[PDB]
Design a protein around this motif. Structure first.
Motif, short mmCIF file in Angstrom:
data_model
loop_
_atom_site.label_atom_id
_atom_site.label_comp_id
_atom_site.label_asym_id
_atom_site.label_seq_id
_atom_site.Cartn_x
_atom_site.Cartn_y
_atom_site.Cartn_z
N UNK A 46 -48.61 15.44 -5.11
CA UNK A 46 -48.45 16.30 -3.93
C UNK A 46 -46.99 16.37 -3.42
N UNK A 47 -46.15 15.37 -3.72
CA UNK A 47 -44.73 15.36 -3.34
C UNK A 47 -43.90 16.36 -4.16
N UNK A 48 -44.27 16.61 -5.42
CA UNK A 48 -43.48 17.39 -6.36
C UNK A 48 -43.82 17.06 -7.80
N UNK A 49 -42.86 17.20 -8.71
CA UNK A 49 -43.02 16.75 -10.09
C UNK A 49 -41.71 16.22 -10.68
N UNK A 50 -41.84 15.38 -11.71
CA UNK A 50 -40.78 15.17 -12.68
C UNK A 50 -41.21 15.67 -14.05
N UNK A 51 -40.29 16.29 -14.77
CA UNK A 51 -40.52 16.92 -16.06
C UNK A 51 -39.43 16.49 -17.02
N UNK A 52 -39.81 16.14 -18.25
CA UNK A 52 -38.87 15.89 -19.34
C UNK A 52 -39.36 16.53 -20.62
N UNK A 53 -38.45 17.19 -21.32
CA UNK A 53 -38.73 18.17 -22.36
C UNK A 53 -37.79 17.93 -23.52
N UNK A 54 -38.24 18.11 -24.75
CA UNK A 54 -37.39 18.07 -25.93
C UNK A 54 -37.87 19.07 -26.99
N UNK A 85 -43.30 9.21 -14.65
CA UNK A 85 -42.74 9.84 -15.83
C UNK A 85 -42.49 8.84 -16.95
N UNK A 86 -41.87 7.70 -16.66
CA UNK A 86 -41.60 6.68 -17.66
C UNK A 86 -42.89 6.26 -18.39
N UNK A 87 -43.99 6.11 -17.65
CA UNK A 87 -45.30 5.78 -18.21
C UNK A 87 -46.13 6.94 -18.73
N UNK A 88 -45.67 8.17 -18.56
CA UNK A 88 -46.33 9.28 -19.22
C UNK A 88 -46.19 9.19 -20.74
N UNK A 89 -47.25 9.51 -21.49
CA UNK A 89 -47.12 9.88 -22.87
C UNK A 89 -46.32 11.17 -23.04
N UNK A 90 -45.72 11.32 -24.22
CA UNK A 90 -45.39 12.64 -24.75
C UNK A 90 -46.63 13.40 -25.19
#
Lengths: 75, 48
Positions: free
Chosen positions: A31-39, A8-13
């Motif tokens: 395959x474990x799941x996800x992290x999501x961040x939204x604004x 997530x930290x290295x994901x682009x917006x």
């Protein structure tokens, strides 16, 4: 989980829409799941989800639907 | 009539569209994209 946040930290917006409303988002799925961040440029929102929560919530949202959570996450 | 309705309505799909899925599954109406899988205990006689 921690690998999801660290991805997530290295994901682009990226940009997303619906019907005059719009978000900035990043997701890191595995395959474990996800992290999501939204604004909405005014507040920021977070979730992380694991395999258990994927199975339970996909079933409660689509009762008959019997894959392992990997199919739900890959879709 | 009501069993097909309830089966569709729990899956939240338009009846007739769900009937589409039923024709394709049960009446060989499958395309090459469609893969249907059929299951039965003779012991319990439960089909799905």
């Amino acid at each position: 989980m921690e690998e999801l946040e660290q991805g997530l930290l290295m994901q682009p917006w990226a940009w997303l829409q619906l019907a005059e409303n719009s978000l900035l988002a990043k997701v890191f799925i595995t395959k474990q799941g996800y992290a999501l961040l939204v604004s909405d440029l005014q507040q920021v929102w977070h979730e992380q989800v694991d395999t258990s929560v994927v199975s339970q919530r996909a079933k409660e949202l689509n009762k008959r639907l019997t894959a392992p959570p990997a199919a739900f996450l890959c879709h | 009539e009501s069993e097909i309705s309830q089966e569709a309505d729990d899956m939240a799909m338009e009846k007739g569209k769900y009937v589409g899925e039923l024709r394709k599954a049960l009446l060989s109406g499958a395309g090459p994209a469609d893969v249907y899988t059929f299951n039965f205990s003779k012991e319990s006689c439960y089909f799905f």
